[PDB]
Design a protein around this nucleic acid. Sequence first.
DNA 1: TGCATTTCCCGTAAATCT
DNA 2: TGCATTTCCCGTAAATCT
Lengths: 559, 559
Amino acid sequence: VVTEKQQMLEQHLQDVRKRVQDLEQKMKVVENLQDDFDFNYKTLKSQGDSVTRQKMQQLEQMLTALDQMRRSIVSELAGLLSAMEYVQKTLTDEELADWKRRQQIACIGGPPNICLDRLENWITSLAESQLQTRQQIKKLEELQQKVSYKGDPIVQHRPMLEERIVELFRNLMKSAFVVERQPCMPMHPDRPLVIKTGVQFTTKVRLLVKFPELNYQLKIKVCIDKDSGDVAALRGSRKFNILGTNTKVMNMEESNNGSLSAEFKHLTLREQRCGNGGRANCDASLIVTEELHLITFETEVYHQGLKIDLETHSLPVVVISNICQMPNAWASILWYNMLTNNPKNVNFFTKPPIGTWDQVAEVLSWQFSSTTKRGLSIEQLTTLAEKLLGPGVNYSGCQITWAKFCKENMAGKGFSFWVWLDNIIDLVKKYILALWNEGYIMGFISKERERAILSTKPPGTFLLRFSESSKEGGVTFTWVEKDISGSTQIQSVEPYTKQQLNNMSFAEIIMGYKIMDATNILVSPLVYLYPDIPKEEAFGKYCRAAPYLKTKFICVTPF
Amino acid sequence: VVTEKQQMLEQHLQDVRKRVQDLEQKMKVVENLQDDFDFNYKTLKSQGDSVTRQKMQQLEQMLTALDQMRRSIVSELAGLLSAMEYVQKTLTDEELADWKRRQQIACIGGPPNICLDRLENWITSLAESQLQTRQQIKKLEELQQKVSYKGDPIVQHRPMLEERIVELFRNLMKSAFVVERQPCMPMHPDRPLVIKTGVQFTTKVRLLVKFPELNYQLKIKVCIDKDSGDVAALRGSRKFNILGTNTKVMNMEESNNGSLSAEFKHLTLREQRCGNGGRANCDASLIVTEELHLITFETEVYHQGLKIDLETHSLPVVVISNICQMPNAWASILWYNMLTNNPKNVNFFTKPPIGTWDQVAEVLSWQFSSTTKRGLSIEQLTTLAEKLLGPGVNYSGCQITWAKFCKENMAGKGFSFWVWLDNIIDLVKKYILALWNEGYIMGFISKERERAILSTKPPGTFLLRFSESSKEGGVTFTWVEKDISGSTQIQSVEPYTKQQLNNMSFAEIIMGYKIMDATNILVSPLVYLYPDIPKEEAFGKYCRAAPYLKTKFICVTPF
DNA sequence: TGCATTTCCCGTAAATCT
DNA sequence: TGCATTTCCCGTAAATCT
């Protein structure tokens, strides 16, 4: 929906249109007058060998009128130029920049609407206004070539009018060239900005100035690690090359608005082996999953007498060689986009900024509502804000470092926070996908707060959560049955590794698991998911000459 | 061990050595005599301006003696040449050819000893004998340049002596260039002659003439589909190129004998895309797994004034693009090597020859004693000779077509004989490897002959065999428990797909599987593997603040 | 050496050829 | 169309770099 500021921009853009139209009218009038004066001047010489000299008076009066129209025109153009100069800034440095920011957020799973139609409509409108304005200025020039005098306002102001309009257009064209769709592997739609060597990836650029005359006219060339893989920047980085179709003609294909776009599919990266530089120097100058690269797009436009060089680039990209590097790669992308709006800080991880728990907790939620049906409840969130910060109340402004989030392992484990969570999110797909679904799982709750269940709810009531001390990821639950039941001693079962969920689904385990107490007594799974919901309404849904004895496996704990 | 024929060849080779040595002696003598005659002749002219003319008599008598030695020499050389010509044939067309045949057999899992040391020793001996013989012939030539007369036996016979010796050597060099190790992917050691595009493969050539002078002198170039991927041969075939290090210098590296060899590692195939020809025409002119190619090796040798071009090639190779094509590819390799000794019949599958059950049953056994500890007992074999030929007694000379073996599916199934068996052999590795082992499994036995167990042996006695009606492969057993036991109604359980053996091993199932009869009655697995061996002696060997309830799964049939 | 990182490649699934 | 065949590429394991 349209904000107030966007209402205003739209209004200004129409005011600009109107002034251009008023000027056009004024040019038509001044030119007809100039034609009339030109004709009368000649007719008067056809006899310059009766009191027929009010014509001389007519001739002088027309001339005076022309001068006045010319001053008026030149004065209005200057005014229009200044207005354009003010508004173009609102358009490019504010609205478009807000769009660039929201693209960052959308990449990391945030609230989308990275729609370019409005911007394209604004940008195109202004561009049309500017070209028509340039043509008026050019007309003033040809009018002067036919009729001029001492003090002619066209001779004194036109050059500056040209310069200003060329500068506005030249700059609007450059801002209008953007990356509509960041480098991403079709196999990992939720993981843009992470490229694996050898695997195909696509990316798309757009030119927000919707000029049909330019259809199929521009050739866009893409490359990675342009020039900066030399001097006056980072050092020790791996360097890469793009394989596949390197260039692409921009066109208004695929219908939808008929926007000028250029899409590159089947692109591939390969490491550029050989050469030298250094490579070492303190922690090898950034681990591979913290090194950042830029994919650059370039072309040139020749239009109505002008040559304009256009260049744009993707957001920093992490390049990996194997998929096992994806989790850390993603953490770098999360962190970068979560905390900076700088679109080309390739050195970002030299000294990474610190985040607040607020910003990190939002990001973590998105990572769930991406791959799945829904995010994270505070019951899951807060009891994870603890995992990183232990005891405490209200984490609002609590700082979280890159080290704490991903670069280093958690307090007493051999793996990092993010990698552990990424493994959950993974697992909660390949298996238990459907089962995670809407709200059937607690997932993140400390044994202490986990005690506040059977300790307050009736025997049978269970709760669902993840393996908190395993790298690859696992899932479990709660129940009370053993010995003589002192005061209901809460229990859990050894985590099921990915392989363990290939045999039976988690809700198949919940709805089909007894307990072999002592001997022969094979009791049962416990009723009522946490509040008071009997297991069935929630889990009973994801369940399902001759012969040979048809079979099915079950585990069931044997003490 | 040395056959009688090999004893003889060795003997002939030594006779050849001896004659060369006797000739050398004879050359030494004739040359000293020629020196003496030459000297005396001059001494006699130093006075040809006392009865000092018995010297003239001495001079003539020396000359006569020289002529006689020369006739004798020329006569013995001709004789040696003929002997060499006879023996070289025994060496190249018989012993070496037998070695080429045994290489075929070894490739398809047969009885090895494809050892080249003997051949190399024979070949090298003959080569040395021939070069020394060539040098004598050359010496006769220089002797003639100094002393000649009318009827000189050197002038009349030498040219033919040269021609014959050059021909023998030139041909021995060519036969001596062989493929010691056929194209094979290191990842599939039991599958030589089957190459997958993109995957590395190695191959090695040897030059059986062990001349140290040639160390590091020859450059061997390898290629695939040489010239024949043009005219006067097959048509519609895919064409390929070799990627990686295309050439390799031959040397006496890796110690062992110091044989001249050249090994190519990290070779890769890629389809040569584009062009034309036809491609279609009747069944697309051979399915991809029946198309055959040749990897050719070439080099040239310049030695002691001779230029000799050497060329050799691998056995026909099948080129696949995906591993799922391996089973059919292998069947083509089996069939080819089982039934022909032609080393370059690329059209073989145009009209494939027919095999006898004997030859096929041997081959099938090897395929087991390759990947595993041991082959196939007739109890398994014969009851598989039936699967292909049904009812019958003594299959000795029963014909088996390519269609029946692999090209077409079995009678009432959607898959072929060989592909089914290859899947067993596979399965009997990834899982049940250890378990297949020596003699614990029947594996192949028709329900009819399978009845001759509990129908003669006491309740409990079980038998082990494979899923006869599943493409991917499976395993099962026998036992009697259900209803009220009419007369012990033999039973089996639904086959366990590859995934089903990832949870519990087959012998873990045998030693840990009860039967849930009616309700709560969970009986047990049956004792005594087929004869009278209690399950345990055979299968019991492959079996094996806090906390969390440690777990293990079991299936057990629930009627 | 052990670590960080890349390469190798099967096997499943999707794409392409015919 | 459905079939034959190749390409894509994850993920496990081995190789290489440092």
